[PDB]
Design a binder for this molecule. Structure first.
Ligand code: MG
Ligand code: MG
Ligand code: MG
Ligand code: MG
Ligand code: MG
Ligand code: MG
Ligand code: MG
Ligand code: MG
Ligand code: MG
Ligand code: MG
Ligand code: MG
Ligand code: MG
Ligand code: MG
Ligand code: MG
Ligand code: MG
Ligand code: MG
Ligand code: MG
Ligand code: MG
Ligand code: MG
Ligand code: MG
Ligand code: MG
Ligand code: MG
Ligand code: MG
Ligand code: MG
Ligand code: MG
Ligand code: MG
Ligand code: MG
Ligand code: MG
Ligand code: MG
Ligand code: MG
Ligand code: MG
Ligand code: MG
Ligand code: MG
Ligand code: MG
Ligand code: MG
Ligand code: MG
Ligand code: MG
Ligand code: MG
Ligand code: MG
Ligand code: MG
Ligand code: MG
Ligand code: MG
Ligand code: MG
Ligand code: MG
Ligand code: MG
Ligand code: MG
Ligand code: MG
Lengths: 145, 137, 159, 169, 296
RNA sequence: GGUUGCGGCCAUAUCUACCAGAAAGCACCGUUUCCCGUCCGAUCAACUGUAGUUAAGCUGGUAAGAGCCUGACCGAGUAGUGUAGUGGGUGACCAUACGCGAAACUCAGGUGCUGCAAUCU
RNA sequence: GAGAACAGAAAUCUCCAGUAGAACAAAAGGGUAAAAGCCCCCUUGAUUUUGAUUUUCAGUGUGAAUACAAACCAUGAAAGU
RNA sequence: AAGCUCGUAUCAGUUUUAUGAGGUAAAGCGAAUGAUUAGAGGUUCCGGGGUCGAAAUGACCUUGACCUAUUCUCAAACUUUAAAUAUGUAAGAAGUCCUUGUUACUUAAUUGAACGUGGACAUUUGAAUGAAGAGCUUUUAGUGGGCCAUUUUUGGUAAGC
């Protein structure tokens, strides 16, 4: 619970990016039964950001949709386009914290193709859906984005 | 075991002691204060835990195994009989025990056995196990 | 019925450590405390006067007072949904200086160094701590070390 | 070797076990005093027995330890009574020895019907020099085996000076 | 030792060996604890002990303080330093004890500044007194008697040393009831007698009483007093001068040495067995089961 | 390097058996007038350092020694355990997934380190 | 364990081994070896003043306890207690 | 409920790093205590039997106890070792360094202890993640029969106990 909050996942099918270090790796470890996660590709970070990507701006949650919205709030850190944003995320840049926190938790729909699997709450490895499923995270996220 | 193969054919070892006391609420009062008096004893036993152990001449295998089979009926819950890799009640598989014995190393004792170690006083180690210290027969 | 006296439940807590009974070695007394020192608490069952209550066993606090044979330790004890301030009069045999800070202090002294060493050179510092990074690429060689292939083993019984 | 690992008498302790306290005991005391010169000590019963007729801390015995020349005089003097023949027992595993004699008159010492007759326990504890190591206050230590008194060495010692016999097997 | 005695695996395994310095019968920790520890609100203030120890005929005097790495000699005076001063015989005696104490007081008190101020009783009528704090000035050097294992008898010479360090100027808190000439059956010190021990009156009166009741013995012990023509009477002037000489220059003369450390090194190594190697030890086994086994 | 006095950590210092120790030091050791304590000058007190001894103490070395200390993919990723499932099984219980992970065992290595002052062929 | 007249399974004397296997009013558990146990010596600090603190807790009371301050004392050569 | 003082601020049913505490699970029992199966070898001027005997502190058998090195088995109120889960503190501006004032405390000592004056260094100022901010104050309702599930778990043969 707490962890799921600190990673800003407080409703089903919502998603965020996480930079991997020991100190977050353990956090992931703690919430495996309740999440599905993996290594996202350039392709799915781009389409995540282009379509479902919103900024937090004096709260509110503002669509990206114009580049001046980003330069306004992220420009301080270099970063003055939607692609600058994507670039910071994917390369885990020096300013990933600000760049990624700026991103409001993505809100996906349920997968179109379905889940694979007849039961979600076992681990991927056991025919289920949760845990690190590595590069197979893009197939899923795309079906939900 | 004895009637079929003789009272000195074999060695039976109950390998399990009933150290756990079973209580009983024998019986005006109802459930008020209901701490049993001792009723009987019982061994608490594991999975894979040996219950009986028996040693013979190989040429009696069946007779022993049929004995353990018949005793099975005397017990709750499935148990299964197993042929050992070990030499009798010893800790050693039949070859390793043979290698140690037909060396020097092993010496008789009441029912069991003693083994020369490379540790300790060279002196009173040469005392015991004289038939070592040649390294042949 | 129930019993809840002062050292209740403490059988092995206050108990003495295998082969370590007897006099307390003299350094326990040559050690020196000042206000603000952080100390860890552990009771020495051999010293009955001036002994912490079991709740404070294993606990760390800050010195607030120094007397002839004692130090006063403040501990925050949380009772309810709130902490309260507790002051503990302990004899020196139940207190030791805490290491809980030695990594900090060592790190400051050093952070001051790497900085001066940097500043008066041509900046570039980086002196916050960082978690275990995931490891990098690497090329493992085969030369001297071809892969050995294992498979799983059958069932056996040895007994 | 030997130079100074000689063989002295640590001390001689005489002991009179009486079944009781009172006159009979205090007389048995007098004996030891006029025989030791030194003023003797009294021992209390360690518990109760009732078939020995003795209550705890009753005073039940007296005794005295004598060291140096005085000890030899008395030793010999009872060794006389015992005609200079002891036994392969007597000599303890740790090297002391003792013997009893009844009738204390059998060694100098007149009679006096107001004193009575008592039997004594003679017990000779032997040691070599440097026994102090075990007995002193600081740096208390123990004497090494090639110094510790033994039965063999004390019987040997005995069989020599005095020129007495050991007897038995 | 004895077969049915001796020890088991069990016994030795569970054995808790004492502190070394107790196994050695040297350190009484119960009192060391109480000699050394400081008021916790007096922080790094050392608690200097005046350690007095009697060997088979050397008197040792150190002012020592404690440190969790080891203790610390401030100053040290051995009664074998008394030939520098006019004492050659009987340096294990009461008056030597006094002298050596006196030497220790003066010596440090010197190297501490309180050399000039704080002299203690220069006179010595052995009246009873500790050294009083001067009016507006440094409080004196305070130090506590480490008798060590000594028994406390009223007469002990362990207190002889105490007297000269406290007649020397040190503040060494003490009472009178263990000084020679303290009346058991009245809380009263005869000082005409304690003066006598300070100067060695009991020894000289012995020397006298042997000079006409046995010169077999008087020559045996008191040999050297002959050999240097010092008969009794002068024994006071001997020590009275010793005090002068000691006060007049206590600053400790080390020995002229001869032969370097490096030398005492090499020659002592000559008599020092060095350990063995397992390879070496393995060769003593194999060798043993060559012989002791293979049928001679 | 030895040794002493005062130590710190308190067995790699302890235990059992045996041998070796120069020099100095400790020691054992002589004495009983004196302070002092004893049934006993053994302990404890004092006096000598003279009359004697390395025997013991002490120090060190030996031992397929007892013990103790260390180490290791030795045993063992075993036992146990946090977490998951509309997993298996009549049950007792047991597998599996993401993690944490012993103890015994076995084998090897070791057997006091060291502070302050004095002293020493 | 081994030794000494009466003296025995058990009386009193001695030596050796002895990590506590004893004792410490009492229940049990902690603790303790030049002591915290045993013998002796001197004692009244089991006293005076009024606060803080820990346990139980409401952070009330009560019980019990802890470390100090200000007294007067005890003991010890003393540090101290 | 009413708010009040402030606000990037300080905040946390979370991780990480560093440093503590613990005696449960497991384990152990040829380690202490307590239990338990088997033999083997010892030891008696000495627990009792029996042959020789006038006896023997006599010898020989014998069963007991003990001792030695072994063997099978156990513990909520046993234990050397000793987890996992839980658990205390710490990760800086209320910080680190220099200079040298105050006192009746404290030191042999202007020695220390406490509190200071003067000076040196800014946000990679000192881990992660989050933070619809944080802190604070008053007053008052209802409630003070609880029941269930997984896991741990006591009593009971058991119970929808
Ligand atoms: Mg994140
Ligand atoms: Mg589709
Ligand atoms: Mg469809
Ligand atoms: Mg389709
Ligand atoms: Mg389905
Ligand atoms: Mg879609
Ligand atoms: Mg009814
Ligand atoms: Mg009923
Ligand atoms: Mg009942
Ligand atoms: Mg069955
Ligand atoms: Mg209860
Ligand atoms: Mg001890
Ligand atoms: Mg008390
Ligand atoms: Mg000799
Ligand atoms: Mg009688
Ligand atoms: Mg034994
Ligand atoms: Mg063994
Ligand atoms: Mg004392
Ligand atoms: Mg010599
Ligand atoms: Mg006399
Ligand atoms: Mg003498
Ligand atoms: Mg003496
Ligand atoms: Mg020798
Ligand atoms: Mg010595
Ligand atoms: Mg060994
Ligand atoms: Mg588990
Ligand atoms: Mg579920
Ligand atoms: Mg299930
Ligand atoms: Mg399993
Ligand atoms: Mg008790
Ligand atoms: Mg003591
Ligand atoms: Mg009262
Ligand atoms: Mg009330
Ligand atoms: Mg418990
Ligand atoms: Mg268990
Ligand atoms: Mg088990
Ligand atoms: Mg274990
Ligand atoms: Mg056991
Ligand atoms: Mg085994
Ligand atoms: Mg347990
Ligand atoms: Mg935590
Ligand atoms: Mg944030
Ligand atoms: Mg906000
Ligand atoms: Mg309310
Ligand atoms: Mg209410
Ligand atoms: Mg109410
Ligand atoms: Mg109601």
């Amino acid at each position: 619970r707490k962890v799921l909050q600190l990673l800003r996942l407080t409703r089903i099918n919502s998603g965020t990016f996480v930079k991997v270090t020991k100190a977050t790796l353990e956090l992931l470890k703690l919430i495996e039964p309740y999440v599905a996660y993996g290594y996202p590709s350039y392709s799915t970070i781009r389409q995540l950001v282009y379509k479902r990507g919103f900024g937090k701006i004096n709260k509110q949650r503002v669509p990206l949709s114009d580049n001046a919205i980003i330069e306004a709030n992220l420009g301080k850190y270099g970063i003055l386009s939607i692609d600058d944003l994507i670039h910071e995320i994917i390369t885990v840049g020096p300013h990933f914290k600000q760049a990624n926190n700026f991103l409001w938790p993505f809100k996906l729909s349920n997968p179109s193709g379905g889940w694979g699997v007849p039961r979600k709450f076992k681990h991927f490895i056991q025919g289920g859906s949760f845990g690190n499923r590595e590069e197979f995270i893009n197939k899923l996220v795309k079906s939900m984005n | 075991m004895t009637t079929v193969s003789g009272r000195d054919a074999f060695h039976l070892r109950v390998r399990v002691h009933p150290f756990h006391v079973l209580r009983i609420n024998k019986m005006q009062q109802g459930m008020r204060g209901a701490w049993g008096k001792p009723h009987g004893l019982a061994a608490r036993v594991d999975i894979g835990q040996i219950i009986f152990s028996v040693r013979t001449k190989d040429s009696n295998k069946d007779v022993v195994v049929e004995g353990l089979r018949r005793a099975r009926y005397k017990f709750p819950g499935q148990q299964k009989i197993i042929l050992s890799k070990k030499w009798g009640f010893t800790n050693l598989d039949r070859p390793e025990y043979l290698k140690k014995r037909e060396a020097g190393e092993v010496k008789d004792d009441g029912a069991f056995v003693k083994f020369l170690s490379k540790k300790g006083s060279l002196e009173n180690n040469i005392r015991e196990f004289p038939e070592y210290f040649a390294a042949q027969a | 019925g129930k019993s809840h006296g002062y050292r209740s439940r403490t059988r092995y807590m206050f108990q003495r450590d295998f082969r370590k009974h007897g006099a307390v070695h003299l350094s326990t007394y040559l050690k020196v405390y000042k206000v603000g020192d952080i100390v860890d608490i552990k009771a020495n069952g051999s010293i009955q006067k001036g002994m912490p209550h079991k709740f404070y066993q294993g606990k760390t606090g800050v010195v607030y007072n120094v007397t002839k044979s004692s130090v006063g330790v403040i501990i925050n004890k949380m009772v309810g949904n709130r902490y309260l301030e507790k002051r503990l009069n302990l004899r020196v045999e139940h207190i030791k200086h805490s290491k809980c800070r030695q990594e900090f202090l060592e790190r400051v002294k050093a952070n001051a160094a790497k900085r001066a060493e940097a500043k008066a050179q041509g900046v570039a510092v980086q002196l916050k701590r960082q978690p275990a990074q995931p490891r990098e690429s690497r090329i493992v060689s085969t030369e001297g070390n071809v892969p050995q292939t294992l498979a799983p083993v059958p069932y056996e019984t040895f007994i | 070797q030997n130079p100074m690992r000689d063989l002295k008498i640590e001390k001689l302790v005489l002991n009179i076990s009486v079944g009781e306290s009172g006159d009979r005991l205090t007389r048995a005391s007098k004996v030891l005093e006029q025989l030791s010169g030194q003023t003797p000590v009294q021992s209390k019963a360690r518990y109760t027995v009732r078939t020995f007729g003795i209550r705890r801390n009753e005073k039940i015995a007296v005794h005295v330890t004598v060291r140096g020349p005085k000890a030899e005089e008395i030793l010999e003097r009872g060794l006389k009574v015992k005609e200079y023949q002891l036994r392969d027992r007597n000599f303890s595993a740790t090297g002391n020895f003792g013997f009893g004699i009844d009738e204390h008159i059998d060694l100098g010492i007149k009679y006096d019907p107001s004193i009575g007759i008592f039997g004594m326990d003679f017990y000779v504890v032997m040691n070599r020099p440097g026994a102090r190591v075990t007995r002193r206050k600081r740096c208390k230590g123990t004497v090494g085996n090639s110094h510790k008194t033994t039965k063999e060495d004390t019987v040997s010692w005995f069989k020599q000076k005095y020129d007495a016999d050991v007897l038995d097997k | 030792a004895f077969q049915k005695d001796a020890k088991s695996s069990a016994y030795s395994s569970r054995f808790q060996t004492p502190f070394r310095r107790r196994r050695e019968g040297k350190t009484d920790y119960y009192q060391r604890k109480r000699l050394v520890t400081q008021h916790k609100a007096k922080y790094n203030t050392p608690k200097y002990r005046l350690v007095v120890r009697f060997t088979n005929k050397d008197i040792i005097c150190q002012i020592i303080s404690s440190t969790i790495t080891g203790d610390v000699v401030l100053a040290a005076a051995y009664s074998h330093e008394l030939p520098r001063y006019g004492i050659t015989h009987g340096l294990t005696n009461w008056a030597a004890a006094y002298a050596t104490g006196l030497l220790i007081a003066r010596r440090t008190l010197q190297k501490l500044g309180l050399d000039e101020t704080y002299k203690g009783v220069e006179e010595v009528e052995g009246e009873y007194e500790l050294t009083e704090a001067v009016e507006d000035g440094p409080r004196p050097f305070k130090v506590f008697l480490d008798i060590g294992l000594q028994r406390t008898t009223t007469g002990a010479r362990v207190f002889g040393a105490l007297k000269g360090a406290s007649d020397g100027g040190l503040y060494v808190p003490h009472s009178e009831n263990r000084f020679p000439g303290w009346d058991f059956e009245t809380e009263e010190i005869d000082p005409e007698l304690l003066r006598s021990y300070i100067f060695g009156g009991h020894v000289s009166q012995y020397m006298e009483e042997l000079a006409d009741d046995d010169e077999e013995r008087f020559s045996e012990l008191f040999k050297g007093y002959l050999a240097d023509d010092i008969d009794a009477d002068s024994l006071e002037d001997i020590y009275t001068s010793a005090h002068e000489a000691i006060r007049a220059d206590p600053a400790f003369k080390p020995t002229e040495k001869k032969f370097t450390k490096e030398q005492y090194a090499a020659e002592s190594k000559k008599y020092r067995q060095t350990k063995l190697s397992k390879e070496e030890r393995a060769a003593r086994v194999a060798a043993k089961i060559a012989a002791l086994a293979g049928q001679q």
